[PDB]
Design a protein around this nucleic acid. Sequence first.
DNA 1: AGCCCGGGAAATCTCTGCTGCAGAA
DNA 2: CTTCTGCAGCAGAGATTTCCCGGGCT
Lengths: 449, 449, 447, 449
Amino acid sequence: IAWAASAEVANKPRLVFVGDELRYAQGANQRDVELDGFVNYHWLTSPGGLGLPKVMLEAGINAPAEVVGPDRSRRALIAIRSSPWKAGHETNPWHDEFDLDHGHVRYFGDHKPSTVGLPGETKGNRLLLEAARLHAGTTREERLLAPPLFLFRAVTVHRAGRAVVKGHVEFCGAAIIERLEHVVQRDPETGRSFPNLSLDLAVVSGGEIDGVDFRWIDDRRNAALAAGETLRHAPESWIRWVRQGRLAIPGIRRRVLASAVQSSKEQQPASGSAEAATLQTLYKFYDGRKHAFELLASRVAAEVFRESGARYKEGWLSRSSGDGGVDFIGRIDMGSLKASTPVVVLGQAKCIQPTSSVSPEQVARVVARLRRGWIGVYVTTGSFSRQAQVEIIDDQYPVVLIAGGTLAATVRRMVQANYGGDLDALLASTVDEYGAAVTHRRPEEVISL
Amino acid sequence: IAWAASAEVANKPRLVFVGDELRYAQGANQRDVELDGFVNYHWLTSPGGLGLPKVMLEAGINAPAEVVGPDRSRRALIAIRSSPWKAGHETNPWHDEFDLDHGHVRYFGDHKPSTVGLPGETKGNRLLLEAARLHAGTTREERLLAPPLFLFRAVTVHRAGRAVVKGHVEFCGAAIIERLEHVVQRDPETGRSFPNLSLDLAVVSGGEIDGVDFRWIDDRRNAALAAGETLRHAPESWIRWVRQGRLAIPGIRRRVLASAVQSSKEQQPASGSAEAATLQTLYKFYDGRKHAFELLASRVAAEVFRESGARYKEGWLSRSSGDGGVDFIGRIDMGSLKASTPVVVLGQAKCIQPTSSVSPEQVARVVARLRRGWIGVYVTTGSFSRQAQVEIIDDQYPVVLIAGGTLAATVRRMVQANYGGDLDALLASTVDEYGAAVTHRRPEEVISL
Amino acid sequence: WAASAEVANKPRLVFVGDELRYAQGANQRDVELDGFVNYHWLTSPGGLGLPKVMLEAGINAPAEVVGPDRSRRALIAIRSSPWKAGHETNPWHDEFDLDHGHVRYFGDHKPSTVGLPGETKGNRLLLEAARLHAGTTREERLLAPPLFLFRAVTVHRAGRAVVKGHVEFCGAAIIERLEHVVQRDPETGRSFPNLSLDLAVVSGGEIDGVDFRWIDDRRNAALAAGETLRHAPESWIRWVRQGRLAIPGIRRRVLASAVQSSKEQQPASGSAEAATLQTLYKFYDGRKHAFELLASRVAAEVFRESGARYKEGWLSRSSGDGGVDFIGRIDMGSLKASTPVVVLGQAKCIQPTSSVSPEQVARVVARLRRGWIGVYVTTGSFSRQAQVEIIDDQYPVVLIAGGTLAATVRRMVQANYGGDLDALLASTVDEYGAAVTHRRPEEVISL
Amino acid sequence: IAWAASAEVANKPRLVFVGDELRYAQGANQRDVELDGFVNYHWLTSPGGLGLPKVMLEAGINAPAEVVGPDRSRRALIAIRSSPWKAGHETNPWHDEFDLDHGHVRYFGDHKPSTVGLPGETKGNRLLLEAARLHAGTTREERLLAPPLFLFRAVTVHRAGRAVVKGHVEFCGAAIIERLEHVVQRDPETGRSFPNLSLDLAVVSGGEIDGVDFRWIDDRRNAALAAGETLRHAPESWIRWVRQGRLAIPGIRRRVLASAVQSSKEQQPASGSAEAATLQTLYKFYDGRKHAFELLASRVAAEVFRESGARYKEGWLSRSSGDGGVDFIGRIDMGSLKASTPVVVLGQAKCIQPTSSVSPEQVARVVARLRRGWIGVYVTTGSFSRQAQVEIIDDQYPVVLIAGGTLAATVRRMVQANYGGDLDALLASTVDEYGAAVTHRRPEEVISL
DNA sequence: AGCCCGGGAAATCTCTGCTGCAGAA
DNA sequence: CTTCTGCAGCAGAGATTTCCCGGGCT
């Protein structure tokens, strides 16, 4: 009669997104989807339809009893707990830390000075040892025998009008063991150093959703399922890792960007549009004269900074000759009347073919010029490479990107704002006023201006 | 008609400012004031009234004829000229260092690799020694006979029209020799080492007027009048350098900030006003409460960037207790949407009576937390110390200053615009709704939000 | 050969920081003495029959051992200073950092000894061992005798005084850097040349300490030098084949908080460095400028202690305090073209019982551009908040409290004006504005 | 009748200058002032009217007979002849190095392989130990009697349309030993090893002039002379060292002002260098695999920082898969033992041909990620472009440039002293390890280990 | 006689200015 | 048939490069 419940639980979906807050309490029920206004942990792990003991989440790491598949016995999984009691991290080198953005995690063993035996005597560290031996071997079946590592970090909600600490967890994703190294920590109370296992783990990609649902955690606990039969509900990252090996880790590692990135198509105007044709006329006109293109880049950048609702003044153009990383410069004032701060804005302009794209080093050449409190801006006829936007966003470089469609729209504004001599004599206005004064002056001299 | 042209030119306001455009041309009359839109150099030095030969600015280190008074024959003055090769400065040997704000100018002797022997056979070095012995003299009489050093640097600018490369120079002011020492320089062209003379100079100040009377040279090249009557048109800084010794140099040093210094009374609201009483009630209310003040400052700083119409996003509170280097966080998107780049704003507040000023050390603690493209903001009911302000301006700290006046004005504006009721409603709303941090994350994560 | 196989049957390991019972009395057979492990039993096992190697103050080692291929030198044993109990007051002493696996030791050379440094048998074998560890072949490196460090201990045992005839295991180390210094002993009272040795403590890998079987196996004559390493630490084994290239990465790392309490930053009361600190406090209480110059020289000595290249730029100003008190520069590179590192510094003389606020050092931190480092010198200690703010927010600034300052000053004085502190103090107060210039920190590059 | 000549010597200044070409002959006389147009060495060292014995000078360390001053027996001077003896064919890695631009010189002892016992068993080494003993020293009295070391280097000169390398010598100035270390040297051609002492020293400055007054030399070389009255014509720098001690060592360093920009030819090894072919093989070998060259460059930079005797630790590699922004990471501990601070080094390595330079964009891509107090290092076979280095100097980029001769130098010196001549095992090691040292840790995580 | 971190004009020098021709997408 | 895109020791101001002067001294 229990087979019906097992099947019922087996078929129904149980989804959880990475970074979500899960409810963790003593006792309670595993048959409840929601508890105290939050998603139940035990229900997500072991719904109870299988009639199996719950998966406990306690100090250090925790692993269920050995699950005997028809083929052979297998370790179900490993639930890992990290305790930042009240955002204690990271004042000290014990330093259990998660970077869920780039998909890297560093955790440490539960070994303590009170323990007499060598590291690995504790249940947790020994399970970490077995997992380490299983994550590194010759055969390809032992990796199927290797239990997955589920990351959980303590979190205080301060929600629903009631501030509470503990009793809540956070799923940081599934992890694989990249490294295991014996390190020596220090107990301040007794002033005594102790050996312990240090684990470097990598979080894999969760797919398009970035959140995973686990019907396969029951598969790992299923007594009637073979080791290679449990990968049915597994994410594509993990199974493709099983296929390829540890060489696929950089490709399967989870990647979260703070801001969205734009494809080449979206930045540019439509192909059949006359805006793109106008952009190509800009390409033809400013190919010979890069200096005009620079002056226009200054005008456009100005229009953008003023479109943001911020105060901007264009200082000048760095050089008309001698190349270098700076083409021109302006100033952004941050704040309101009688309350502001000066910001030096280094304007850069590069004219290139639409097919080719700007390389990250060319942008980083402008980024390197930037001192503290400065903002760069890059204006190009084409688009930006993926690695460029990656280096800008992930490393948090403050650069304003001006693509083809943006400058095209800006031009569309300016040409009807001032239509003297039609569209073309604005470009002529770029060449005629291209001299636009000059300066050997450092960027810091723009403040006094 | 000896004194006919002299007596009228003897009382003229020959005050000159640093940064103006001066004309140095061959075949320039001493009678005409301005040449082709700008003032003439030869006219400025000796405008025909004296009958003296026009001082020619040549050969780097330059000086007029020796002057013999009744006693102690002296050198009238010294005309120092630093010129771009071009690209002699900052791209070549020589490249005399120039720092205007700190009044420090490093200059090189007239010794050349083509000139053999110890520095120096050229008149430049000998004049440099003859002057330096008087400038470094511990005797006031020596400081009386000490030849003034008038510095000049050719700058390209003009008004409208076209840029200038020759015939145009800029008055850099007068300077006093800080140090004199020998150096070794190497020529890239020949690869041969040669000795030279190097010296550190201290540029003086003209005061609030910041003007330098060029009538000084008249009594400086007068053989009849000596020392006592030669300082009549000299700047007070120079006469103070004459009366006292080299120990008063840092006190008489020229220090000009790019921005403007705000007085304590200037930062505070007008005396007797309603906003003043409002601020007094603010300090009265928030003297005991800190977190509520921090939140209030977060709200004030929230729309102070948004007042211009600029794109802003209000962040979170770091911690309920234990504080942080900066109390609250904000974000500033720059440019059109999807082209917007995040700018991290780190704010901190402190409650103190308007009669008190903010120490530079804590502001430094704020700006020490800054990174690439990060800006700070400090909010207080009091004013800021002058040292703090000048340290921020001179070293270009990127931070917004919120004094008691701006705070009171912005707060009253907030109350009337969004409430209009008694401030008590706002205060209470703040204390109940926040002052308690729901989210405690790293500041770099504000970009993801 | 039953006994040797018997002691080969049972493992022998000792962790770093293990207290050992040191007694000329007692025997080789027994495993423990007076509640502590026996040293002579540790170094000399009962299943061998070899004599007991004695551990005396300073460097000590058994004579060379004849091998089938070539003669092999027995390991090096080092005994630490009393630190101090009134026995040694010398500024140049043994500095132990077991957290980063870095240990600086100073050899034994005395004014009574006439000649050149390294003439004594211990120092002869020491320099020869230095030759072996700096060997160009793998054979020469495996021929190199291990260096085992030991320290004296001042503690408490079972509610009683401690300790009489007890030491502490500091681990095994590899000869990395050598130096030639000239020190001066006040009680000697003549000055004498002395050797300096920078050692890198190895990591035991999976184990904290090392296997004691290694030494007992290497001491044996039949053991071949290539095959004499079996239980040797993986770090040492890797180093033998890799050479000097392995040294930077194989050092033992102990994860611990870098925050030192106010008491830890202050020298011992009986150290006699503290008295110097107090004299400096009363002296520079009125004159801060001489303290700024003194701090510049002290920092200059600190950076040159690691063998780096420091060049003193100048002092910022002689009138009033500010963000920076003094400026220096550290050049590192191909030397055909050297990459300069700007050094900004501030010094404040306060009471040793007073703590330095984080804002005051943040005033210096805020002046740091990319590739620049800060220096803060104070007679007192640093506050906890300051330390944790510097560590957590990753501030590139060295901190000099009362202890480090007094120690460095003592070193400098003894090095030059040894016998007279007033001469060094005179050297600090004579020139005020001689080193003082008004320049931008980025102008130190030209110098 | 040698008294009058001595008085003659004392009255007229006798000066030598740095960079001067001197004629040295073993069979010359002390009488003739100059030989073949060039001033004589012996005549300058000691005149014929002095009565002083003929001083001998040969390859390596040369020390004249000891002298007894009335106060105490004293060592006058130490002459040092340094010649590569290469004729451009040097393979000796421990050959002496000279950098007079920064005033640092690496000298090496006269210890020989066949020379037995512990170093030094030779004259030069021992008297250099005495010299160093006096150099470090203690109290002023020892500093007074401390014998100066004068450097003479074999140079190629040109005389009357004819040029011969041997027969002349150059004056490199008087220097003081900073530090002395123990090192093991090996003959490149034939495999061997011998102990020797290595000295890092620095040349002082000549004060007003660039060189040394040899009249003071005569004053010190005098048998009967006072203690502090021995030097009246001595350079002020040496007197400053005398009064201060080691405290003035960083301040008295000889400095020559020149452009730090190096050309392609200047960075790369000589035309007859055997390391060139090795570099070609390195290009052909790492042409397919770049990350192996990245690890190679990591260990190279490590050896470079370890060459100064500083504190450095091995880092890790970012990816070893495809391409990426940062090639390798490292850490440097700056300060003493008890007191130090960690700094993060971001290293980049791209394999190009020695004839090709490095564009500024590529290195600026590395500079862009450098935080506050962070440095970087670029290691490559090819040289660096002029614009790149200029860009480094202008913006004060903290980067170490390893290219051409330097790379081959540290690599060869490494092979000779570590892997013992076999480069095959080294290359193979770089091949096997490109996937072993790869961690996904943050650059800030290097502080942990 | 001389020099010198010069300016002036008259000597080349730099690099996009483009028009009608033709011939091609 | 279009309508643009090639061909051409072409035009030509602003910017360098040469060379002639300069002014005021020891």
